[PDB]
């Protein structure tokens, strides 16, 4: 199809571009604002302290960014409960990078753990996407009797039930969690949504991360992903 | 098969656990590392500069945190970075190397992902068929030499399956690792770790890196799409 694929590439490349121009246009001015603050603060500090040299201070900063990135603070990060969660981020290919592997050992093990883990997960999700497939099929099935009876043709019910497969799953797996997190971690609704979608598309910037509330999330992920596996493929056709 | 899938879940859950115990055992000893560095560095700077006062410097730091949180770097949203960022979204790698501060941007980021990913998913599926039929017709030439040297045509399908990988591997893993190790001055171990993390679309963003790289990604992913599925069967 080798002409059609070059046609796609060009579309993708124009898409990436058209994206980057929108992201830039939205972000750059606020980044720039932020950077004006810093740049000004740095300079004042140098002027205010003549015994300090620029090439001295410049190093100090490099430390702080590295240390703050490493997770120092001007509640253990590798307890069991966080470690599990981390382990989870790997197989799910979400990879927040919320925490980082310092040791080489860990990096090395991380490799083998991924190669095995991911497909093992990919299988399980394919299995859940069949059972969640046959779950929602049998779910609407009793109420399908009432739909057909109220003056609806058999071509039209397949679009209404397709919408409700989504709007119900959506309600459970998107709308509901957004409140939950917005409440729990005291984010905005916008943020909750943004987090929710970023998480489920398995992008996982890790810009955002999170007694009944602790385990509930691990579950929610698995079923949500199954749900969204289908939502993506439907768009693949739509395209 | 609904009994078999519950059996898998339990395996996954034991796997996650067995993982977390390994990660913990390796990492937990270096939790407080990061804070020791800072605390020590702060104090040296004070000792090294007597004209600086604690309560002066303490402010300056508070700025840094706020500015870094705001997204400055002691241009991050030029065109060339933005493209790359845009790329990280559709590929579902999502380093989070840079982050969307504005709400506008977050909002747009949503719609951009929903469209972009499947558009990419199509392209990768297309490349994984043509790169599929490319390597098949490539190693198809060397299949003639395998058959002649006391090998049946049932066994050549395993030898060429190995060489599909070992050649692709060479190009798409071994080669890049040197490249980056050299270029960005990482260790070979790190290069590998980065390479694999990138290609599995995990993208911690612990490690990140001129146009030749953008290409390499696309073909490598196609390659690794197949490498995962082969392990799925293998298991």
């Amino acid at each position: 199809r080798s002409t059609t694929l070059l046609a796609l590439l060009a579309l993708v490349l124009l898409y990436l571009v058209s994206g980057a121009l929108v992201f830039q246009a939205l972000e750059q001015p606020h980044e720039q604002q932020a950077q004006k603050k810093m740049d000004h603060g740095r300079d004042q500090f140098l002027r205010d302290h003549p015994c300090v040299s620029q090439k001295s201070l410049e190093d100090f900063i490099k430390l702080l960014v590295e240390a703050l990135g490493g997770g120092a603070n001007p509640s253990s990060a590798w307890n069991l409960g966080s470690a599990f969660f981390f382990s989870g981020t790997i197989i799910t290919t979400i990879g927040y990078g919320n925490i980082v592997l310092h040791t080489d050992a860990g990096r090395l093990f991380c490799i083998f753990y991924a190669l095995v883990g991911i497909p093992l997960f990919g299988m399980l999700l394919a299995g859940v996407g069949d059972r969640l497939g046959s779950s929602l099929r049998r779910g609407i099935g009793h109420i399908e009797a009432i739909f057909l009876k109220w003056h609806v043709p058999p071509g039209l019910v397949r679009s209404l039930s397709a919408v409700l497969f989504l709007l119900i799953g959506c309600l459970l797996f998107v709308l509901t969690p957004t409140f939950v997190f917005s409440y729990m971690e005291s984010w905005s609704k916008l943020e909750a949504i943004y987090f929710v979608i970023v998480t489920l598309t398995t992008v996982g910037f890790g810009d955002y991360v999170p007694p009944a509330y602790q385990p509930l999330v691990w579950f929610w992920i698995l079923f949500g992903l199954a749900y969204f596996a289908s939502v993506l493929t439907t768009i693949g056709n739509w395209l | 098969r609904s009994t078999t899938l519950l059996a898998l879940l339990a395996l996954v859950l034991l796997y996650l656990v067995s993982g977390a115990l390994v990660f913990q055992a390796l990492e937990q000893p270096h939790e407080q590392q990061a804070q020791k560095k800072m605390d020590h560095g702060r104090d040296q700077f004070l000792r090294d500069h007597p004209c600086v006062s604690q309560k002066s410097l303490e402010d300056f730091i508070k700025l840094l945190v706020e500015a870094l949180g705001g997204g400055a770097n002691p241009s991050a949203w030029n065109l060339g970075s933005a493209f790359f960022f845009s790329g990280t979204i559709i590929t579902t790698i999502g380093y989070g190397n840079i982050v969307l501060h504005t709400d506008a941007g977050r909002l747009f980021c949503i719609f951009y992902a929903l469209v972009g990913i499947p558009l990419f998913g199509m392209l990768l599926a297309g490349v994984g068929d043509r790169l599929g039929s490319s390597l098949r017709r490539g190693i198809g030439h060397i299949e003639a030499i395998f058959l002649k040297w006391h090998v049946p045509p049932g066994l050549v399908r395993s030898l060429s399956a190995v060489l599909f990988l070992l050649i692709g591997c060479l190009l798409f893993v071994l080669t890049p690792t040197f490249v980056f190790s050299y270029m960005e001055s990482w260790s070979k171990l790190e290069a590998i770790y980065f390479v694999i993390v990138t290609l599995t679309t995990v993208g911690f963003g612990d490690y990140v890196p001129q146009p030749l790289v953008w290409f390499w990604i696309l073909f490598g992913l196609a390659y690794f799409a197949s490498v995962l599925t082969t392990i799925g069967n293998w298991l």
């Epitope: 190093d59 490099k62 | 560095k37 020590h40 700077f45 000792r47 090294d48 500069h49 007597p50 260790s187």
Partner: antibody, heavy 123, light 107 residues
């Protein structure tokens, strides 16, 4: 090129003050990013870092050896100076003058060293 | 005071050979460890800074690694010139050194 060369008395009498001096050529005391240090090597070749002074003139000391040491400097001559009070036969060692650099702020590594001066503590 | 134990104490090796020394730290040092070679009647030379980074103007046959407590310095291809006592020193105050590790070259 950068050169460091130690100076002072080869012999010191117990319960006196040892005082040495280091002369830097090809480089400035007061240049930002490099600090300066005194290190000693005992008979038996075991090294103890004593003290350490900034380009800016800030001081850090081995607490084991505090309350006897004072390091000073003279920016004009381009030198710096070690003192150590109430010397004993313990403090007999080969004193070394060295420049300090960082591998991220704080991480002190001594890149360029001095000739070495042998100081003895005897009656 | 952070204590640096360095093993082995002594060893001798033939030229061309590869060699590896250990420094073990009493606390977690977070990759802030440096390696020096002292020849007789001389002050130390800096080989390796920041655990793994090779000092400029020192041949590639030297290479160090480690993180945290346990580090190691490796010489790939001993020349006759590699004789001396080797030390490790840590970055945090007070800065402490290793006890020394003497390398004889067999012939």
């Amino acid at each position: 090129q950068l050169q460091l060369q130690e100076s002072g008395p080869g012999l010191v009498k117990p319960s006196q003050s040892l005082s040495l001096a280091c002369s830097v050529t090809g480089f400035s005391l007061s240049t930002g990013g490099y600090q300066w240090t005194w290190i000693r090597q005992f008979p038996g070749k075991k090294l103890e870092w004593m003290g350490y002074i900034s380009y800016a003139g800030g001081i850090t000391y081995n607490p084991s050896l505090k309350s006897r040491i004072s390091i000073t400097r003279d920016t004009s001559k381009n030198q710096f100076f070690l003192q150590l009070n109430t010397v004993t036969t313990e403090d007999t060692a080969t004193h070394y003058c060295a420049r300090v650099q960082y591998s991220g702020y704080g991480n002190a590594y001594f890149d360029v060293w001095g000739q070495g001066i042998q100081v003895t503590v005897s009656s | 005071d952070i204590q640096l134990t360095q093993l082995p104490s002594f060893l001798s090796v033939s030229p061309g050979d590869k060699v590896t020394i250990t420094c073990k730290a009493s606390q977690n040092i977070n990759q802030y460890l440096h390696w020096y070679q002292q020849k007789p009647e001389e002050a130390p030379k800096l080989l390796i800074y920041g655990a793994s980074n090779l000092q400029t103007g020192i041949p590639s046959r030297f290479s160090g690694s480690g993180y945290g407590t346990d580090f190691s310095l490796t010489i790939n291809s001993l020349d006759s010139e590699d004789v001396g006592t080797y030390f490790c020193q840590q970055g945090y105050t007070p800065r402490t050194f290793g006890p020394g590790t003497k390398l004889e070259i067999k012939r």
